[PDB]
Symmetry: D3
Subunit: 169 residues, 6 copies
């Protein structure tokens, strides 16, 4: 059993993330998906709580017919010590074989701990990113079209738009 790992803030989870995830699922048996910076919420850059993001991911992966036997969803708080972050991830996750990240720090930390590391198989453009999603939530643009419907429903339930607009005053 070959297990990959992916880590991202997912503020919020959007179609870009999902596309990356599906691409990774072509080359691993199971994917561990870590929601990074789980401690950060209620800012313009990081509006949603760990729990809200768990909800988004859990619903999105279920709505798209990905079998539950092929993924794990795990919130992970940042820590002060970079040299310990890999150990922190390992404690919170099933054993894994390969890490997917385009981030140099994430790459290097996992590589120094002896893991295989590769870039994600797909890169999405800025117009489909979290920054664009949040900007559209703020400016009454079409944020919904950038997200799976199951994520839009989470955002409606938790009043995500009202939250982010209030925080931008």
């Amino acid at each position: 059993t070959m297990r990959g790992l992916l880590v991202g803030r997912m503020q919020p989870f959007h179609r870009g993330h999902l596309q990356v995830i599906k691409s990774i699922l072509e080359e691993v048996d199971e994917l561990i998906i870590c929601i990074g910076s789980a401690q950060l919420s209620h800012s313009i850059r990081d509006p949603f709580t760990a729990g809200e993001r768990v909800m988004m991911l859990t619903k999105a992966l279920s709505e798209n017919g990905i079998p539950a036997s092929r993924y794990y969803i795990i919130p992970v708080q940042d820590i002060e010590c970079n040299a310990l972050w890999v150990g922190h991830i390992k404690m919170l996750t099933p054993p894994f074989d390969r890490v997917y990240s385009g981030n140099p720090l994430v790459q290097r930390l996992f590589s120094e701990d002896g893991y295989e590391v590769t870039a994600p198989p797909l890169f999405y453009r800025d117009r489909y990113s979290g920054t664009e999603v949040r900007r559209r939530m703020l400016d009454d643009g079409d944020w919904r079209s950038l997200l799976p419907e199951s994520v839009v429903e989470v955002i409606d339930e938790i009043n995500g738009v009202e939250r982010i607009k209030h925080l931008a005053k």
Copy 2:
């Protein structure tokens, strides 16, 4: 629409826990399952890491016919302040309506925060017996779902607990 919450150490996850979970799923649309004391591992009482327990639960709920749309699995570290623990849980979980616990402290903490609280529908198969059988070469496997046994083989759980029990 109606979401329940359950919290336990699950050291390890056994057929008892699964029976309770299925029973709760007859009363709620979705169940949030929190793995408590996520920080504790590598002792006789708490042998498995948070990650290992996430793995056990994820596999066990998938192997049994439970749709993924009906549960969430969330590791939760203990904190020093009891008066903050409910807030900690809330931050880490989807919104929920009702808590299932037989533990007086858990009940009272959630009750003071305005949640409906009730005992689990079923009382049972115990973690103490599972761990004792792992230590004494008893039939621990029969107390667990097969998917959990497979996790324990992969992570060398028995060897771990036996080593930790030395002098």
Copy 3:
């Protein structure tokens, strides 16, 4: 200006504590009162939150005609490092000259940091202590008579008795 310091869990604040406080106020201009183990609540030994204990002290000292200019009330969480606890107290409090404690560890920590340390001027018996108060709350004894009335009112408002009884099941 001569400033004393006193530290206790005050679970809850009872007439014994108050008697000690009044005795200390005969020999200092101002008394800093620290509520220790501020992080502990919702147990048989430590039922009340920091905030609840602040309330108890603030009300009790006001009801008994002690002028506000003569005291400070400060919640203090325990820390893991004993060697740092005095520094932690100092950061959270006004400057002070003398510490009142009968506890050997508290005495020694403050003495090693160069403070004058003395035992409290009065010692109350076990039958008037927090242990007796909590035991009476549990067993339907006369807990009210061990407390100032203003503290009884705090306990009624926060449902302290119901809390402690539930926790003892």
Copy 4:
């Protein structure tokens, strides 16, 4: 019976803050005053310790005619999780009914937790001006209650901030 809450860094406590407080006390029976960012000291922006600020507030509210039965003064450290901060405040404070803040984050956090929230009744005297005058030998004293000036003399606040502003 009706309890308000106010939160600010109070670096230092000045006549502005006191005016706001007196104005709030016309609308509530009791006011909980939280000294925020209690962990920050010894910078140009945040020169004073939690303890020093507790001292300033305690003395200033006593010197002005405010009865002790009408307020509580509580230092509160910042925490990493915004979603926990309200729970943190609640643990450290008496129960309260209404929050006074002009800060959008503070407003929204308390509002999501079910509290009534409103802007302070008065907008003003600023901490930035006080600190600038301490640094540049201006008339900082006139911006503060006399009891606060006395705290700052005792703790050598001016000398501290001047030393910290060096190269």
Copy 5:
């Protein structure tokens, strides 16, 4: 370069520890010595601070002619997650190859992380242990004969006996 690691509380550092250290130095080029439970001080079981123990070890190893090029002395606080403790040690130390410990937990944690683990080459009897040292400090026994002279000098300077006696009241 073959590097060993040893970890102990060293409350205080005594001749037994030193004997073990010298035996280990016959088998490795360099020895990393970690002072565990660095956060604990001012109790009967753990009287000395991290700093005081660093002082004891530094002085003792220098007085006994062990070259400075052959050891490292590193204080290490305990952490709540056993699954992170090895990562915590690794962050605070030079790279190492082999761990010396008789403790089952320490053995298993390091072993799971891929390190070679072995028992210490020598075991000292109870009569020469920290427990006996501390007991003799309390009861006016001959504690000095159980410690290197350089450690005795540290304990005199920091008033260690006076401390532990006060804490036992």
Copy 6:
């Protein structure tokens, strides 16, 4: 016995630091050397772990013939409360008499706690500083000539150049 204290990040330890250390050793019997920001690693500004820096200092001071009896090397994590940092240092170190620092904050914190504070006896120019070392590591300049040979050897073993280059992508 007169004991000084020095604190710096030492990212990495270079000849400038060593020169300052030797100058201080003309004025004190013993020097406590604290490695500050011990929690920070794996960034352009702070590339090396606490352990790696302990290794650099231990090797450099031993290669240059400074007797082991004249120094202590101690990693110190930053903390959020400036008013506690001196207490944190004191817990982790032997007792000391005088602090050497050019940093206003460090000076004032120690000074408020009653310590004698002075500037270091020597100031090295920017061209010999950590910033210049790290810049040369990144840009294939002569970084080696700015460090003691023992430190170069540490950096080769831990692949420090490869690390910092990867982190700069």
